[PDB]
Amino acid sequence: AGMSEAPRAETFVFLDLEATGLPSVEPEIAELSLFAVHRSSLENPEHGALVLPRVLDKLTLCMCPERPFTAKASEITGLSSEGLARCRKAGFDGAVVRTLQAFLSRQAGPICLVAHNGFDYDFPLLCAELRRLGARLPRDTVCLDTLPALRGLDRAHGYSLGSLFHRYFRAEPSSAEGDVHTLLLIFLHRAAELLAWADEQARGWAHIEPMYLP
Template sequence: MDALSRSRPGGAAALAPPAPSRREAGWPGLPQHVAFGFPAARLEKPAARRPESSLRLLGESGSRRSSAMAALQDFQTFVFLDLETTGLPHDRPRLAELCLFAVHRRSLQCSPLPGTPQLPRIIDKLTLCVDPQKPFTLEAERITGLSNQNLKENRKADFNSGVVDILKGFLCRQMGPVCLVAHNGLGFDFPLLRAELWRVGTDLPPSTGCLDTLPALKELERSPGMSYQLGALFRHFYGHGRKNHDIDRGKEPDKLKRTITARSDTQTLSNI
């Protein structure tokens, strides 16, 4: 999730360029936070809709519920995704930094000690900075520490076929099927990443899962006055002993997201 968008739960429709639309399908009887059929164009929510879902597939799921259940059960690797961009959704932002942490499902299983999450040791990591080909807003520069100038000074190329090859190579070396995980991912990260991929004429495999921890957290944690911004969630789970810089610059959200996923495994991903 982009640092700028952590307090902005919507805005996906402004991110994605036109593309052939695909039908969004839900499955009666599944938990309300589970749905399939990640739309290929925009992620607008229809006026009359089911409760917001946290898990979708990039491609069509088919017409049989058994196929959906099999997809839920089969994800082997969860890839935690975080993006930095030139602005908020209403700014029609471009991607400036991509960070991926890949964790096999074995490392997300429950800790042998009750109540203690087992934080993974085996993690594949990928971080790429790119020239967004668009000016940063002042707020984006302040929060991310990125700017058009420092990216240019460090000779960073734009989001091109080379980035795509690295990204696909990283994902292909993971045990599949793969599920991307992001906080407010359905509202921001996933459509923005796909928009960048579409600009260079490609996409991720349609079987790629997309898990949004935001609706999962809203279902699991319903404390009065609860804030679902990533920094606030970190403090909620881990206390106030860390600096905001560590939270905002991505040093600790990985740990938080792994904890969320471990807790969501029995509630949000109960069929895996």
């Protein structure tokens, strides 16, 4: 009875970013991974173990950031400016924006972006990078941050990808892509709850504010 203003999403795009540091540094995306999943699949998880949906769109891109990585970031991401320049990856540009948009256009909309801790990091950062270029996402795309959502669902009935995974699956996880890979499994495990939360609480992408301006 209590419908939200937020349009109901038909595709869930799980995503993760590997960046150059924390907000105070005006970090940049060095790597991004998108897993596009149709609502169907989240409503009928596959297996006797839980497995990724068979029908899945994936997009992983590497870029060379304009500014340096902090030592800790290269360390935890295995990524560095030399490595990215050696492979001739340009920085977040028009090419990247077109690939993102073409890819998103392959999804039945509206789209709900799903990132862990998205509200405080991935979303504003993605938002900053796109803003520099004036790029827009499909209208009525919405956002779900599984971190506040899962804490909410649990206070109703810690929260790093690692603990979450160990607690839900008795152990070991497996990179922007691996991180999206393990976020999806976590989601699949509380699928029914996360879907309802997204329907009732997803934030409009228009409400997301760029981490910083160019």
